[PDB]
Design an enzyme around this catalytic site. Sequence first.
Site, PDB file in Angstrom:
ATOM      1  N   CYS A   1      58.104  19.652 -53.647  1.00 48.96           N
ATOM      2  CA  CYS A   1      59.715  20.432 -53.126  1.00 48.96           C
ATOM      3  C   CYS A   1      59.280  21.781 -52.872  1.00 48.96           C
ATOM      4  CB  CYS A   1      60.565  19.509 -53.577  1.00 48.96           C
ATOM      5  SG  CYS A   1      61.709  19.543 -52.716  1.00 48.96           S
TER       6      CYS A   1
ATOM      7  N   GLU B   1      61.459  13.550 -46.598  1.00 46.05           N
ATOM      8  CA  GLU B   1      62.783  13.872 -45.857  1.00 46.05           C
ATOM      9  C   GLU B   1      64.605  12.793 -45.833  1.00 46.05           C
ATOM     10  OE1 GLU B   1      62.333  16.661 -45.827  1.00 46.05           O
ATOM     11  OE2 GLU B   1      60.379  16.587 -45.960  1.00 46.05           O
TER      12      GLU B   1
HETATM   13  C1  LIG Z   1      55.072  14.229 -49.748  1.00 44.05           C
HETATM   14  C2  LIG Z   1      55.886  14.797 -48.655  1.00 44.05           C
HETATM   15  C3  LIG Z   1      55.407  15.859 -48.190  1.00 44.05           C
HETATM   16  C4  LIG Z   1      56.148  16.402 -47.147  1.00 44.05           C
HETATM   17  C5  LIG Z   1      57.448  18.157 -47.587  1.00 44.05           C
HETATM   18  C6  LIG Z   1      57.510  18.969 -48.971  1.00 44.05           C
HETATM   19  C7  LIG Z   1      58.362  19.728 -48.253  1.00 44.05           C
HETATM   20  C8  LIG Z   1      59.940  19.465 -48.824  1.00 44.05           C
HETATM   21  O1  LIG Z   1      60.501  20.022 -50.234  1.00 44.05           O
HETATM   22  N1  LIG Z   1      60.344  18.661 -47.836  1.00 44.05           N
HETATM   23  O2  LIG Z   1      61.256  18.261 -48.197  1.00 44.05           O
HETATM   24  C9  LIG Z   1      55.852  19.747 -48.299  1.00 44.05           C
HETATM   25  O3  LIG Z   1      55.728  19.826 -47.392  1.00 44.05           O
HETATM   26  N2  LIG Z   1      55.605  19.969 -49.536  1.00 44.05           N
HETATM   27  C10 LIG Z   1      54.141  20.556 -49.356  1.00 44.05           C
HETATM   28  C11 LIG Z   1      53.099  19.770 -49.245  1.00 44.05           C
HETATM   29  O4  LIG Z   1      52.654  19.455 -50.292  1.00 44.05           O
HETATM   30  N3  LIG Z   1      52.479  20.372 -48.402  1.00 44.05           N
HETATM   31  C12 LIG Z   1      52.128  21.274 -47.255  1.00 44.05           C
HETATM   32  C13 LIG Z   1      51.388  21.524 -46.704  1.00 44.05           C
HETATM   33  C14 LIG Z   1      50.185  20.471 -46.908  1.00 44.05           C
HETATM   34  C15 LIG Z   1      50.599  20.208 -48.259  1.00 44.05           C
HETATM   35  C16 LIG Z   1      49.125  21.107 -49.871  1.00 44.05           C
HETATM   36  O5  LIG Z   1      49.586  22.273 -49.802  1.00 44.05           O
HETATM   37  C17 LIG Z   1      54.385  21.840 -51.236  1.00 44.05           C
HETATM   38  C18 LIG Z   1      52.985  22.555 -51.200  1.00 44.05           C
HETATM   39  C19 LIG Z   1      55.454  22.654 -51.239  1.00 44.05           C
HETATM   40 ZN   LIG Z   2      61.388  18.021 -50.358  1.00 45.06          ZN
END
Ligand SMILES: CCCCC[C@H](CC(=O)NO)C(=O)N[C@H](C(=O)N1CCC[C@H]1CO)C(C)C
Ligand SMILES: [Zn+2]
Length: 186
Positions: A111, A155
Amino acid sequence: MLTMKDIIRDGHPTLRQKAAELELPLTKEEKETLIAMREFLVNSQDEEIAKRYGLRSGVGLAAPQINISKRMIAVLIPDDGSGKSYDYMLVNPKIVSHSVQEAYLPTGEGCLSVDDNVAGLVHRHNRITIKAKDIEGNDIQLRLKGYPAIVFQHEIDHLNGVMFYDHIDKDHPLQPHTDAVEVLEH
Ligand SMILES: CCCCC[C@H](CC(=O)NO)C(=O)N[C@H](C(=O)N1CCC[C@H]1CO)C(C)C
Ligand SMILES: [Zn+2]
Protein backbone atom coordinates in the site's frame (compact mmCIF):
# COMPACT_ATOMS: atom_id res chain seq x y z
CA MET A 1 1.70 17.41 -9.77
CA LEU A 2 0.92 15.02 -6.93
CA THR A 3 3.89 13.24 -5.34
CA MET A 4 4.66 11.11 -2.28
CA LYS A 5 4.26 14.18 -0.05
CA ASP A 6 0.55 14.22 -0.93
CA ILE A 7 0.06 10.58 0.05
CA ILE A 8 -0.96 10.47 3.72
CA ARG A 9 0.53 7.62 5.75
CA ASP A 10 -1.11 4.91 7.83
CA GLY A 11 -2.27 6.39 11.11
CA HIS A 12 -3.86 9.45 9.55
CA PRO A 13 -7.53 9.54 10.63
CA THR A 14 -8.82 10.21 7.10
CA LEU A 15 -7.73 6.70 6.05
CA ARG A 16 -10.15 5.19 8.58
CA GLN A 17 -13.20 7.30 7.77
CA LYS A 18 -16.02 6.43 5.38
CA ALA A 19 -15.57 8.50 2.22
CA ALA A 20 -18.50 10.65 1.13
CA GLU A 21 -20.56 9.90 -1.96
CA LEU A 22 -20.08 12.29 -4.89
CA GLU A 23 -22.91 14.37 -6.30
CA LEU A 24 -23.01 14.42 -10.11
CA PRO A 25 -21.94 16.30 -12.04
CA LEU A 26 -18.53 16.66 -10.40
CA THR A 27 -17.24 20.20 -9.86
CA LYS A 28 -14.20 21.33 -11.86
CA GLU A 29 -12.02 20.89 -8.78
CA GLU A 30 -13.16 17.31 -8.25
CA LYS A 31 -12.52 16.46 -11.91
CA GLU A 32 -9.04 17.98 -11.72
CA THR A 33 -8.37 15.97 -8.55
CA LEU A 34 -9.41 12.68 -10.19
CA ILE A 35 -7.35 13.46 -13.29
CA ALA A 36 -4.36 14.27 -11.05
CA MET A 37 -4.82 10.98 -9.19
CA ARG A 38 -4.61 9.12 -12.50
CA GLU A 39 -1.65 11.27 -13.56
CA PHE A 40 0.12 10.26 -10.34
CA LEU A 41 -0.14 6.58 -11.29
CA VAL A 42 1.05 7.35 -14.83
CA ASN A 43 4.11 9.16 -13.44
CA SER A 44 4.77 6.49 -10.81
CA GLN A 45 4.94 3.91 -13.59
CA ASP A 46 7.33 5.96 -15.72
CA GLU A 47 10.83 4.86 -14.71
CA GLU A 48 12.47 8.22 -15.46
CA ILE A 49 9.76 10.40 -13.89
CA ALA A 50 9.36 8.15 -10.83
CA LYS A 51 13.11 8.35 -10.22
CA ARG A 52 13.26 12.14 -10.60
CA TYR A 53 10.42 12.67 -8.11
CA GLY A 54 11.13 9.65 -5.93
CA LEU A 55 7.77 8.03 -6.67
CA ARG A 56 6.69 4.57 -5.54
CA SER A 57 5.20 2.63 -8.46
CA GLY A 58 1.49 1.88 -8.09
CA VAL A 59 -1.54 0.72 -10.08
CA GLY A 60 -4.31 2.23 -7.96
CA LEU A 61 -5.12 5.29 -5.85
CA ALA A 62 -8.14 6.33 -3.77
CA ALA A 63 -9.11 9.92 -2.90
CA PRO A 64 -8.75 9.29 0.86
CA GLN A 65 -5.07 8.51 0.28
CA ILE A 66 -4.48 12.16 -0.63
CA ASN A 67 -6.66 13.30 2.27
CA ILE A 68 -9.85 13.78 0.25
CA SER A 69 -12.74 11.90 1.86
CA LYS A 70 -14.68 11.35 -1.36
CA ARG A 71 -15.65 8.15 -3.19
CA MET A 72 -13.37 8.46 -6.22
CA ILE A 73 -10.64 6.08 -7.35
CA ALA A 74 -8.21 5.69 -10.23
CA VAL A 75 -6.86 2.38 -11.49
CA LEU A 76 -4.03 2.00 -13.98
CA ILE A 77 -2.96 -1.57 -14.65
CA PRO A 78 -0.72 -1.87 -17.73
CA ASP A 79 -1.00 -4.61 -20.34
CA ASP A 80 0.28 -7.82 -18.73
CA GLY A 81 0.91 -9.42 -22.11
CA SER A 82 -2.62 -10.68 -22.69
CA GLY A 83 -3.54 -7.40 -24.34
CA LYS A 84 -5.77 -6.61 -21.37
CA SER A 85 -5.19 -3.29 -19.61
CA TYR A 86 -7.18 -1.25 -17.11
CA ASP A 87 -7.34 2.55 -17.21
CA TYR A 88 -10.32 3.75 -15.16
CA MET A 89 -11.25 6.81 -13.10
CA LEU A 90 -14.39 5.86 -11.16
CA VAL A 91 -16.92 7.91 -9.19
CA ASN A 92 -19.06 6.25 -6.49
CA PRO A 93 -17.86 2.75 -7.38
CA LYS A 94 -19.78 -0.12 -5.81
CA ILE A 95 -19.52 -3.90 -6.03
CA VAL A 96 -23.05 -5.06 -6.86
CA SER A 97 -22.25 -8.78 -7.15
CA HIS A 98 -19.33 -11.16 -6.74
CA SER A 99 -18.19 -14.77 -6.74
CA VAL A 100 -18.14 -16.85 -3.57
CA GLN A 101 -14.75 -18.23 -4.63
CA GLU A 102 -11.81 -16.18 -3.36
CA ALA A 103 -8.49 -15.12 -4.88
CA TYR A 104 -5.22 -13.75 -3.52
CA LEU A 105 -1.78 -12.58 -4.60
CA PRO A 106 0.79 -15.17 -3.40
CA THR A 107 3.09 -12.53 -1.90
CA GLY A 108 0.42 -10.45 -0.19
CA GLU A 109 -0.30 -6.81 -0.97
CA GLY A 110 1.43 -3.46 -0.67
CA CYS A 111 0.00 0.00 0.00
CA LEU A 112 1.23 3.50 -0.87
CA SER A 113 0.11 4.71 2.57
CA VAL A 114 1.98 1.90 4.32
CA ASP A 115 5.76 2.43 4.42
CA ASP A 116 6.83 -1.07 5.45
CA ASN A 117 5.69 -4.38 3.99
CA VAL A 118 3.23 -6.47 5.97
CA ALA A 119 3.39 -10.21 5.29
CA GLY A 120 0.19 -12.19 4.83
CA LEU A 121 -2.39 -13.26 2.28
CA VAL A 122 -5.32 -10.96 1.56
CA HIS A 123 -8.25 -13.05 0.31
CA ARG A 124 -10.71 -11.21 -1.91
CA HIS A 125 -13.44 -12.21 -4.36
CA ASN A 126 -12.05 -13.76 -7.55
CA ARG A 127 -14.84 -12.23 -9.63
CA ILE A 128 -16.73 -8.98 -9.07
CA THR A 129 -19.18 -6.75 -10.94
CA ILE A 130 -18.90 -3.02 -10.28
CA LYS A 131 -21.28 -0.19 -11.12
CA ALA A 132 -19.99 3.39 -11.05
CA LYS A 133 -20.04 6.71 -12.90
CA ASP A 134 -17.16 8.02 -14.97
CA ILE A 135 -15.68 11.52 -14.61
CA GLU A 136 -18.48 12.94 -16.80
CA GLY A 137 -21.31 11.27 -14.90
CA ASN A 138 -21.91 8.52 -17.45
CA ASP A 139 -22.59 4.92 -16.43
CA ILE A 140 -19.92 2.24 -16.20
CA GLN A 141 -20.36 -1.42 -15.29
CA LEU A 142 -17.28 -3.61 -15.06
CA ARG A 143 -16.95 -7.39 -14.84
CA LEU A 144 -13.51 -8.14 -13.38
CA LYS A 145 -11.57 -11.26 -12.47
CA GLY A 146 -8.27 -12.12 -10.81
CA TYR A 147 -5.60 -9.44 -10.50
CA PRO A 148 -7.74 -6.48 -11.63
CA ALA A 149 -10.60 -7.62 -9.37
CA ILE A 150 -8.14 -7.59 -6.47
CA VAL A 151 -6.86 -4.10 -7.29
CA PHE A 152 -10.35 -2.59 -7.48
CA GLN A 153 -11.34 -4.25 -4.19
CA HIS A 154 -8.20 -2.83 -2.56
CA GLU A 155 -9.16 0.67 -3.73
CA ILE A 156 -12.84 0.41 -2.82
CA ASP A 157 -11.77 -0.77 0.64
CA HIS A 158 -9.97 2.57 1.13
CA LEU A 159 -13.34 4.27 0.59
CA ASN A 160 -14.72 2.34 3.55
CA GLY A 161 -11.81 2.92 5.91
CA VAL A 162 -10.44 -0.58 5.39
CA MET A 163 -6.72 -1.31 5.06
CA PHE A 164 -5.28 -4.41 3.37
CA TYR A 165 -3.69 -5.76 6.56
CA ASP A 166 -7.14 -5.84 8.19
CA HIS A 167 -7.71 -9.01 6.12
CA ILE A 168 -4.54 -10.83 7.18
CA ASP A 169 -4.96 -13.81 9.51
CA LYS A 170 -3.06 -13.26 12.77
CA ASP A 171 -2.32 -16.94 13.39
CA HIS A 172 -1.72 -18.32 9.89
CA PRO A 173 -1.03 -15.26 7.66
CA LEU A 174 0.33 -17.33 4.77
CA GLN A 175 -2.21 -20.17 4.82
CA PRO A 176 -4.36 -19.96 1.65
CA HIS A 177 -8.09 -20.52 2.11
CA THR A 178 -9.67 -23.70 0.78
CA ASP A 179 -10.23 -23.49 -2.99
CA ALA A 180 -8.96 -19.89 -3.13
CA VAL A 181 -7.42 -18.93 -6.48
CA GLU A 182 -3.72 -18.08 -6.49
CA VAL A 183 -3.25 -15.04 -8.75
CA LEU A 184 0.16 -14.69 -10.42
CA GLU A 185 1.72 -11.26 -9.95
CA HIS A 186 0.94 -9.69 -13.33
C1 LIG B 1 -3.18 -5.78 -4.62
C2 LIG B 1 -3.65 -4.36 -4.92
C3 LIG B 1 -2.72 -3.43 -5.70
C4 LIG B 1 -3.18 -2.02 -6.08
C5 LIG B 1 -2.83 -0.96 -5.02
C6 LIG B 1 -1.44 -0.54 -4.49
C7 LIG B 1 -1.39 1.00 -4.28
C8 LIG B 1 -2.31 1.55 -3.19
O1 LIG B 1 -1.85 1.71 -2.06
N1 LIG B 1 -3.58 1.78 -3.53
O2 LIG B 1 -4.46 2.19 -2.71
C9 LIG B 1 -0.24 -0.79 -5.43
O3 LIG B 1 -0.22 -0.41 -6.61
N2 LIG B 1 0.78 -1.38 -4.80
C10 LIG B 1 2.11 -1.64 -5.34
C11 LIG B 1 2.20 -2.92 -6.18
O4 LIG B 1 1.98 -3.97 -5.56
N3 LIG B 1 2.66 -2.87 -7.46
C12 LIG B 1 2.82 -1.60 -8.23
C13 LIG B 1 3.31 -1.95 -9.61
C14 LIG B 1 3.46 -3.43 -9.70
C15 LIG B 1 3.06 -3.99 -8.33
C16 LIG B 1 4.26 -4.81 -7.82
O5 LIG B 1 5.25 -4.27 -7.30
C17 LIG B 1 3.18 -1.51 -4.24
C18 LIG B 1 4.63 -1.96 -4.50
C19 LIG B 1 3.13 -0.22 -3.43
ZN1 LIG C 1 -3.67 1.03 -0.74
